[PDB]
Design a protein around this ligand. Structure first.
Ligand SMILES: [Cl-]
Lengths: 324, 324, 324, 324, 324
């Protein structure tokens, strides 16, 4: 089978997240069955058998599937939209290398500082929404050591009077630097200057969207409803799926497997369907299937410095192609 | 468990909204059971037992889940779209600091008034759609005291002859002020003036969208259908889940728990699934998981005045970075 | 309860639309039961009792919920998209007041005629898609009396040779008038002229979208499938939910309530879920929860004439704000 | 009822598409029942009765509704998106009448040829994706007779060396003609020339989208799964819903109606729910509820020639309106 | 029937993908039944019969349909969005033929190199996400032999210091080449140069989106949950649908067909519904219903070289049309 080979995986798998909840389920199933074997008196085992036939009546797999399928679809839709809001600088680096001009050191100062300002504004929003980025940069000093912010840029950064998140501050620095480069003629076209500000606002909106998703999550009332629905089912199966003794002649309880194999396969299904939504509710951590942000941060700074510095005005000479 | 720790929460939780409906359910369950204990005569308890076996037949959890899952998905989709229509001024503040120019007091008059005009137009739409903003500004005088509107701006505001909502009026003031700043050369580029009007219309459309969502809600006919579906179920369980006495030998009514634990866990599920849609149907109030508008209003005025006044034309000198 | 107070409403409610279908259901239920009381012979009442146990077998609430939940979600998605295509002129009125110039009467002629051309093009599309707008303007003469079209504009309107809907004609008049105002220098910026034509095409596309939704509705084959599914159920309950006499000892027919209360609550649920889709299939009529178009038409003409005439170049003098 | 009047329709109705499948179902039901009446021996009628109680066990209406509701929602979403990709020229005709200039014959040559180039490119894509357009233009000669392509335009059209669909060729002709009209000063603004190329690419993308939908349909594997699911059900009802004789005393088979009325109403429901997806899988044919393309083709050529020729620079003189 | 003719297909059909899983199901069904015929002892056949009545209780088709319908809808939505991210150059080829100018060889060098740079950047992203493109170009030398990259362009391509995917490198070459053509006057309009960079970033974002979908797939935890749900069902039917002998008198096991025809039709339904998601999870391979990328790569290079070279400035002379 195609998807059949995938269930033998462990890296970010279903068994890596649920293996613990199973033995807390199966262990409680055996501890509640071994009482019915040994220590439970004969009159109260008769009471237990009526309690098992009560709980299996109210154990309905149908409604839980509805609250899982509509809750999960909502979570995976929000999770994919958070990835599209990732601050990428490849669109800004094409406008900068075509609109900013100069082979001298001041031209290279402009192109590298503009691309560092976008990269700094992505570091600042990602250390606020990702714990994997936050342990790389615990303090703003860590951002000065990494090269994204200079100490001169740090003094005026820390002297702005704002109680709010200052990720927008290098975006304003970008607009002051591009207006200076348009004033000094480094930007030959006024329409080119308009394109730089158009593309920076597209970049700044993506940094703003990551703050929006991080602040307004899925409602807690709706996360709690799906969770008590899934665990009201597993308590309706911790009693209602108990193997009663066949000497009592209860109908559809005629074997003593001492292993709820089909109940455990429902637990893999139901608690694993819930586990999809628990891993995508906060996709910016250090888990193995979280968004690889630290590797992404290195890229939008390595490929943007590569593009506006060595690849500025460095073209091969115009050859006639093979199909001329 | 991951989501298991969340059910011990109270702040905007499921128990904070449903705790009252439970004791009006469980109290009516006990008052209807204690009649069957004591005061109900023996011939009419036989009538009661046939009424209980009638109501549990017509109590189907399936169809209610359909009208809840499709109604809730529609409400949470509309609720997230209302948050994206929030009037934010961070895109306008980057165009203003790069297109408007001047270190003198008239340049600072332009940049602060343009950003205050957008902020005033967001105050005006949010006091019409949010009760939390409306108690902060009960009157337009409250908007003059807060600094968003001057008394001179108030005279011509109140002398416009319009029976409709005047939130669009500072947006028209923006377009008159930007056309004046383009006439006096404060805006060096005509394409830059086009960018200001492009971004203001993006801002004005978001203020217009919050009015659209506030006027056209989810249809009342559809809210009433989901509500009578959920409460036709709980009356099919206020009778059909009554513990009849086991001396009558009725099938699948063989215990007298005197506590509808599984019926109460369905009430947590069903009435709590409905409670998701009741809190997101009007997300602009003073509840604890509503949109924090008052804190947002302070931000788009603190970070816009910070950006166009102190951060205008104030850049660190161009240093070679660590990876030069 | 939150949604519990709403079921006591009548204005555009569920009872306002279904109250008639109930007595045609409950009246046919009683007329079919009173035959079983009185006029039906004893041998053919035995035939009736086997017919009731046949129809309640094939009465499944599940599949109908599927064809209602997926049909309704599709209708409410199309209904909300029709409201976003409403021709609003607030975006055009900000570009006109900033790009068109002149304090003389010819400047005011330009600004009022351009905004009237957009408003006329919205009147023309809304009288073709809304019956509430069509009774306000039954003829094009009614549009000349209301001020949206002049008699001079009427002569060339009626002399164009086109068998198709002429709502696009004031949009072409807009582009001829703006090109004339750019030729005479009333529009100082060529980029400003580009912004006027960009925003008019956004306006003209919304008028074009209202024609698209009005022409291509939900497929009739799919409306008929959901309707015969809902009424195959109610005929499976007009027989299968009949109270047979308990002297015959038929199982799960042991009471004679003479009032299908739970069947009537399913009718409120099912026929009311269908009624959501019947009211949003054509949201432009005179019903109480239809789109208030006549009030909207008055607004986009009152607030556009207010904005380009009295508010043109009329700003308060630049005061230092409270937080200078 | 509102939707109740619609089931008496025939034009593109449910009965117009399913009436044939019913008599092939009901005829096979009677031919399989009349064997059980007459020709089937007494020992093998006992075998037939065990086969009927086998097939009605495995006839589940629930799962089929899931594969129909999720398959149909996907088809109607793709069907509505194909209609929005229809090549309409009303946006191009407003830019052409405002940007292209001249009252002489060369100005009218420009405006009519540019609008014919867009209309030709829509004819070429629609004869490749619509069978109703293909029978109107079986050959490119049919396009020369209709006026969309000249014979001079045909020579270079047929001499391009390309094995692929050449619908993009009049879009390239548009860009060469607009660049010529900008070179000769017919286009006064360079920003106006940018607007023409911006709007043509919006037009060319819609022609490209109709090719994309026509090439990548719904997957055949998924169409086959929904089809074998619906017809595995009707064979589980061609046996499992047979009226066995009541002399054998089989439970819940106690009548001999000789007319599967409730089975036929399920066939109207299920096979009709499938028929929604069969008609919207290819919406460009000659069926009565297909997209009226031939009438649309006549419109975008009649209203575009009307708009750029008679309505070019032909405005009523500027009158003061009624509310001056 | 309409969809009835499609089940006789083999090319990319349901039987082409599932025919193997059926005989591994039906073969295991017969091998487990022939034990019950012959080799299983009489006391342990009694144990087998209680095991069959245990497994058919826990075989529920309902919940599996929920995890298939919501998983498949998510996969087909992501699959159609990957096709819209395909790097097509038809929008860039219309801007290049209208903005780049010159009938000499340097003008043709510009137009062909700019269109080859976009086509090279599409080859580079498609050999990273498609195995069908990767076997056409196993090495970058294969890209030099095909004409997309010159050897001179290869030297500086391979000498850039980057550990990441270099598909963005011809997009940066485009922006350097267009800025050179604007400097030398080949691009007459500065707004035209802005349009080239606007359209290249639209192209570069589509190449970036194909990398995003290829890196972030559907979560493996959710693929594993749907797979163990579908195969927990088929093991609940490999036991629970076994034909027990009718001499034991077990209820609803009264025939010995020795062919699980209805169980095999559920396998066609369920395992085939899963097979839809296995083929669209990676749509870029060599299977018959995968995206035809190699044919698409040939087109965007054949029709772009055709459009900017032979069709540059080559128009028919302006004739009066048939409806002048
Ligand atoms: Cl522009």
């Amino acid at each position: 089978g195609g998807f059949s080979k995938l269930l033998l995986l462990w890296r970010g798998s279903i068994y890596k997240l649920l293996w613990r909840e199973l033995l807390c389920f199966l262990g409680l199933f055996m501890a509640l069955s071994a009482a019915y074997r040994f220590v439970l008196t004969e009159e109260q085992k008769r009471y237990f058998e009526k309690l098992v036939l009560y709980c299996d009546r109210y154990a309905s797999l149908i409604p839980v599937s509805f609250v899982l399928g509509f809750y999960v679809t909502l979570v995976v839709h929000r999770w994919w939209n958070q990835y599209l809001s990732m601050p990428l600088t490849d669109a800004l680096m094409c406008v900068v290398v075509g609109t900013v001009h100069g082979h001298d050191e001041r031209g290279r100062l402009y192109r590298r500082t503009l691309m560092r300002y976008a990269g700094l504004s992505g570091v600042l929003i990602l250390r606020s929404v990702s714990t994997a980025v936050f342990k790389r940069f615990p303090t703003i000093d860590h951002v000065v050591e990494a090269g994204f912010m200079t100490r001169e840029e740090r003094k005026k950064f820390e002297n702005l009077n704002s109680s709010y998140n200052k990720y927008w501050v290098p975006c304003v620095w970008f607009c002051n630097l591009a207006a200076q480069a348009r004033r000094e003629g480094r930007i030959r076209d006024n329409g080119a200057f308009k394109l730089l500000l158009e593309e920076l606002n597209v970049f700044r909106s993506k940094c703003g969207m990551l703050f929006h998703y991080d602040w307004i999550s899925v409602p807690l009332v709706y996360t709690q409803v799906v969770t008590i629905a899934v665990y009201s089912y597993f308590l309706a199966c911790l009693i209602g799926r108990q193997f009663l003794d066949p000497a009592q002649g209860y109908k559809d309880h005629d074997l003593d497997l001492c292993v709820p194999i089909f109940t455990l396969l429902q637990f893999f299904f139901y608690a694993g369907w819930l586990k999809v939504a628990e891993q995508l509710i906060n996709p910016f951590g250090e888990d193995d299937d979280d968004f690889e942000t630290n590797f992404l941060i290195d890229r939008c700074f390595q490929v943007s410095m590569l593009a506006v510095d060595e690849m500025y005005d460095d073209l091969a000479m115009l050859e006639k192609d093979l199909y001329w």
